[PDB]
Amino acid sequence: SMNWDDHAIIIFGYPETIANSIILHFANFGEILEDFRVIKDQKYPIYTGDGWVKLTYKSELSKSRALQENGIIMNGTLIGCVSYSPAALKQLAS
Amino acid sequence: SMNWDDHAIIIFGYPETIANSIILHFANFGEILEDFRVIKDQKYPIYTGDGWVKLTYKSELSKSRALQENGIIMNGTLIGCVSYSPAALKQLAS
């Protein structure tokens, strides 16, 4: 029961049609602790809403790499990637 | 030695209905080259689309301040702000 929030990111800005593709893309940077069904091959429940998702990596090395993806284009749309903070999550619409 | 694009940003991720509120927010960091209608007042080209806009600052210091807004929440939505690159524009669904 420790806190891995510093290993977490929020990905945002995408249409929900590419939500699964988003998870697969960011799974390429490390092992994700949430049990997302598309990658099914202490618990980390899923925080997600329309156009955003929180993901937690096992390694901080992975989080730092994922952050470099802020502003990539997937299916013609700009994808946002920021470091997780509770302050941001509290404000998000679902 | 320089293009103005060295002072440009792309802002993205917002509902297109609040596009002009986004522009106002970022125009507050400094004078920009584009003549958007919401900003008070040949001409410089304008690049915008659904949920994104390019802004070019006169001052690199204004761009630097704008970049710090990456990841703020507006209207329950995360806002991305990245340095403009011509690579991204070509792949955007304009």
UniProtKB/Swiss-Prot annotation, chains A, B:
Post-translational modification: Phosphorylated by CDC28.
Position of the signal peptide: none
Localization annotation: Nucleus, Nuclear pore complex; Nucleus membrane
Domain RRM Nup35-type: residue ranges: 3-91
Tree of life domain: Eukaryota
The FG repeat ranges on this chain: 20-21, 29-30
Self-association state and partner proteins as the record states: Component of the nuclear pore complex (NPC). NPC constitutes the exclusive means of nucleocytoplasmic transport. NPCs allow the passive diffusion of ions and small molecules and the active, nuclear transport receptor-mediated bidirectional transport of macromolecules such as proteins, RNAs, ribonucleoparticles (RNPs), and ribosomal subunits across the nuclear envelope. Due to its 8-fold rotational symmetry, all subunits are present with 8 copies or multiples thereof. NUP53 interacts with MAD1-MAD2.
Entry function: Functions as a component of the nuclear pore complex (NPC). NPC components, collectively referred to as nucleoporins (NUPs), can play the role of both NPC structural components and of docking or interaction partners for transiently associated nuclear transport factors. Active directional transport is assured by both, a Phe-Gly (FG) repeat affinity gradient for these transport factors across the NPC and a transport cofactor concentration gradient across the nuclear envelope (GSP1 and GSP2 GTPases associated predominantly with GTP in the nucleus, with GDP in the cytoplasm).
Domain characteristics, as noted in the entry: Contains FG repeats. FG repeats are interaction sites for karyopherins (importins, exportins) and form probably an affinity gradient, guiding the transport proteins unidirectionally with their cargo through the NPC. FG repeat regions are highly flexible and lack ordered secondary structure. The overall conservation of FG repeats regarding exact sequence, spacing, and repeat unit length is limited. FG repeat types and their physico-chemical environment change across the NPC from the nucleoplasmic to the cytoplasmic side. The RRM Nup35-type domain might be involved in the control of mitosis.
Remaining remarks: Present with 2060 molecules/cell in log phase SD medium.
Name used for this protein in its record: Nucleoporin NUP53
Gene source species: Saccharomyces cerevisiae (strain ATCC 204508 / S288c) (Baker's yeast)
